[PDB]
Amino acid sequence: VYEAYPEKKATLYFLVLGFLALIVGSLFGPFQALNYGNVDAYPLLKRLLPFVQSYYQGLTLHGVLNAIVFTQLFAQAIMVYLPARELNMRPNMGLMWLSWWMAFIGLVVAALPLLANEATVLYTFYPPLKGHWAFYLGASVFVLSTWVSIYIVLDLWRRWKAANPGKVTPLVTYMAVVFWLMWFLASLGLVLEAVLFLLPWSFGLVEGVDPLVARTLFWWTGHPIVYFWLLPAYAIIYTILPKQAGGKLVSDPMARLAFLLFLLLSTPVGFHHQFADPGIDPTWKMIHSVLTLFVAVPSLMTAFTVAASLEFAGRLRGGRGLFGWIRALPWDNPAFVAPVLGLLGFIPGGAGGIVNASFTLDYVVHNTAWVPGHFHLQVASLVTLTAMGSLYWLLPNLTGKPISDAQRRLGLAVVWLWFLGMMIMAVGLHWAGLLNVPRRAYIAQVPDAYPHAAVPMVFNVLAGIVLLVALLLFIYGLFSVLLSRERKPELAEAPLPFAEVISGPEDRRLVLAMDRIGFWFAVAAILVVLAYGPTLVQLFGHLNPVPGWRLW
Amino acid sequence: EEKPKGALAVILVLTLTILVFWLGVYAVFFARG
Amino acid sequence: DEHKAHKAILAYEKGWLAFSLAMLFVFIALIAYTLATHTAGVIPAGKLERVDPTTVRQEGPWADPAQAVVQTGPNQYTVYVLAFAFGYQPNPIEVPQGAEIVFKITSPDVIHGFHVEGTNINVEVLPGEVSTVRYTFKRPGEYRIICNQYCGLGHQNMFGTIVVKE
Ligand code: HAS
Ligand code: HEM
Ligand code: CUA
């Protein structure tokens, strides 16, 4: 297990590191949900943890830990370990263990300041909000790690391409390749935003940073970063769920095309986060809008490919008429159950995002509690649930520890609660957003400030209780899996459960074209030079740096 | 065997849910106009 | 079977595609609809219009708050607003009804939000830059301004007031 696949170990450390992160970050959730239901439990939390000074220090850890530390680590686990196991190759271990220590040292470096109240700036850290230099230095190093993650997978692909000239990229690899490439293009904004401004700014080397340029450059990454969260799930959903589900991936090509399209349209769409900004041309915003409705196509595609697969998996295990196939599925199965539930809520999640996309409509919901509503369905439901369920096949595979009857049932427990709780919370937040309730606010410290929002508050609070149990149950579940001296090697070498693929004759021509990865990559690059170049050049001509503020 | 009526339901629940959300807001949009 | 089922999958994969595209295009047609009417005002101006955050409230159109409102057109009034750590100026903002109001907003500290409850006005305010938005108030009375971009510990507590005179 460890010594002809030590990748299993390096992979396992990305998980623990990540799951300890999701646990710590998550603690603040239940609180913030009640906070949105008009209850102040923060003296209660302040008495659990002496170091918390404000709602906002807590929302910062929560944003950062969960959405930045958890998700990247999961990404690293999945989008490196999966391709390696399909190809039956080892990554450069020297390089792989460098990526780990960089994600650990960046994490640590950043935390010290975060936990000391020197970076209460949210996971977006918009200037002139000026946090401690080690939080910028820490996050940068934390991100940069992913650059080794790109390289490593590119290497494995160079290696397999060579042993096999002419041959088509295997599916998971194909996916991991466009994924890491797309993520390299993404990360250019944030790195430039770090290298050119943030880092000098807090190092004392300049007294000021441009708010518009800073956010424009940040949103170059902060959109594709969410796809950088999703694909590792889509990867699993496409090539492993359908096995767990009792059937097959119905289309190899469609899954590549899906991901291709992500490589193309994930990065040039950032002014969707800036509809509400000055100094960016109305023409460009609409352009960025059309392209955003475009990046929604892959997922619309994904809905169909995936649905079919489950219908056929449920057909295979004797599923009946219009809906019969749904019952026939293995509902006893945490690995099956967790992302299928996530996928139900991904429906609404998406249908929100598209409202969000459509320029003029974004002035109804922008910075309300509706964006939270939205993204929780997305990253704290689907990505996280896919993550959660996946321990039930991935963790046995890493360590060789099997899952008992009860730990499974404890998991089923967690996932049905998490999902329901996430559903519920989405009603509240969406509802609250339409009633103009802003986000990122300590609203329970102004009790008579949203009196027309009485009801959705109930839901928030209710989701807060449910999801507190959800998380506690999970922490217990997780650690029982991790701290049992229960071990067998034979199922730890037992292969990952990859699905077989349905593949037609027409594939050939289509799949060969999508393999022209250098070309597709070049286009993606051009798409970003076209979509951001004009606007960036403008800004870089008329730079108005303003001093930093500390307001916590 | 035959036509993926299950998938065709799902893409139909998706389609119904996109419209509700979108038109639901477009309506609100003009109302706050 | 099996191959028999890949064909008919792919067709409807194309078909679902066809549909979703049209549907997505109609959205695009309805959006550039809103863009051709009056409601398009709430879109910030694109033109860069730079100011200095450390002087904005001692010299120029944001220093005296009683200067805020100016007849700038035959039915057009410009209102210079300052969003700042935990409030708005003037407080309240007083604007006449039915008139086109051209809000010019900025900040002397960090980013704030300018979200006028009841309306489509929802513009980010940025130190160093000027958010130009326009809007015609149709129903009179008090409107409440909400800062919806975290600004520091007093964020939750940063409200203003628009007063639209009949
Ligand atoms: C990881 C999580 C992320 C995903 C994924 C995501 C999806 C989208 N979003 Fe979003 N979003 C926006 C647009 C979209 C669009 C167009 C999509 C699309 O990618 C959506 C594609 C999804 C679909 C088209 C639905 C497909 C459904 C499927 C695949 C499930 C079907 C289920 C089946 C088949 C199972 C059935 C099985 C059975 C057994 C029944 C916009 C604007 O365009 C804003 C700015 C709003 C503002 O003012 O800030 C925004 C705001 C956010 C923020 C806030 C950032 C901040 O703090 O400021 C985050 C974190 C976020 C994350 C995510 N978002 N989003
Ligand atoms: C225990 C379940 C969770 C609960 C009850 C919860 C609660 C909340 C609430 C109520 C908000 C809105 C707070 C506000 O706007 O002031 C929020 C924000 C947020 N949540 Fe969660 N959360 C949970 C788990 C997660 C997870 C696992 C992730 C990431 C994968 C996540 C990602 C985020 C992000 C990115 C924000 C935005 C914070 C910001 O604006 O800086 N949440 N959370
Ligand atoms: Cu100013 Cu929130």
Short mmCIF file of C-alpha atoms in Angstrom, two decimals, chain C residues 33-102:
data_model
loop_
_atom_site.label_atom_id
_atom_site.label_comp_id
_atom_site.label_asym_id
_atom_site.label_seq_id
_atom_site.Cartn_x
_atom_site.Cartn_y
_atom_site.Cartn_z
CA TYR C 33 -33.94 44.54 -23.26
CA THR C 34 -33.55 45.97 -19.68
CA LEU C 35 -30.39 47.60 -21.12
CA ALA C 36 -32.36 49.57 -23.71
CA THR C 37 -34.79 51.13 -21.22
CA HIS C 38 -34.59 53.61 -18.28
CA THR C 39 -33.78 50.83 -15.76
CA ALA C 40 -30.35 50.72 -17.44
CA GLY C 41 -29.41 53.79 -15.31
CA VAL C 42 -28.44 51.64 -12.26
CA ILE C 43 -25.52 50.26 -14.26
CA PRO C 44 -22.51 52.19 -13.00
CA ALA C 45 -20.86 54.46 -15.53
CA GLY C 46 -17.82 52.83 -17.12
CA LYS C 47 -15.71 55.98 -17.52
CA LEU C 48 -12.98 56.15 -14.87
CA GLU C 49 -13.53 59.17 -12.67
CA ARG C 50 -10.82 59.25 -10.07
CA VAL C 51 -10.75 61.11 -6.71
CA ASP C 52 -8.53 61.31 -3.62
CA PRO C 53 -9.91 59.57 -0.51
CA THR C 54 -7.88 61.59 2.00
CA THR C 55 -9.19 64.96 0.77
CA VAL C 56 -12.68 64.16 -0.51
CA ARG C 57 -14.38 65.58 2.60
CA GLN C 58 -12.36 68.77 2.98
CA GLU C 59 -12.32 70.06 -0.57
CA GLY C 60 -14.67 69.57 -3.48
CA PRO C 61 -18.24 68.33 -3.97
CA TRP C 62 -18.21 66.10 -0.87
CA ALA C 63 -16.87 68.51 1.80
CA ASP C 64 -20.01 70.44 2.83
CA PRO C 65 -23.01 68.05 2.99
CA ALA C 66 -25.47 70.94 2.43
CA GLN C 67 -23.94 71.24 -1.05
CA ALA C 68 -24.96 67.66 -1.85
CA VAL C 69 -27.87 68.35 -4.19
CA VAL C 70 -27.58 70.30 -7.45
CA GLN C 71 -29.97 70.86 -10.35
CA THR C 72 -27.76 69.54 -13.11
CA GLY C 73 -30.46 69.22 -15.84
CA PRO C 74 -34.04 70.35 -16.61
CA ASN C 75 -35.42 67.30 -14.70
CA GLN C 76 -32.05 66.02 -13.50
CA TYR C 77 -30.42 66.31 -10.06
CA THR C 78 -26.89 65.18 -9.04
CA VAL C 79 -26.42 64.06 -5.41
CA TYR C 80 -22.83 63.75 -4.12
CA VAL C 81 -22.81 60.98 -1.49
CA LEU C 82 -20.06 59.98 0.89
CA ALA C 83 -20.13 56.45 2.21
CA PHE C 84 -17.71 56.18 5.15
CA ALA C 85 -16.93 53.99 8.16
CA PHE C 86 -20.39 53.52 9.50
CA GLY C 87 -22.56 56.06 7.77
CA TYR C 88 -23.63 58.17 4.83
CA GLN C 89 -23.66 61.84 4.02
CA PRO C 90 -25.75 63.70 3.84
CA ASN C 91 -27.97 61.98 6.42
CA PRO C 92 -30.61 61.91 5.27
CA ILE C 93 -30.26 62.33 1.51
CA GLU C 94 -33.08 64.49 0.25
CA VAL C 95 -34.10 64.20 -3.38
CA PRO C 96 -37.28 65.17 -5.24
CA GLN C 97 -39.68 62.62 -6.74
CA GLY C 98 -40.24 61.78 -10.39
CA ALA C 99 -36.89 63.51 -11.13
CA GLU C 100 -33.91 61.65 -12.58
CA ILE C 101 -31.38 61.35 -9.77
CA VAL C 102 -27.74 60.98 -10.73
#
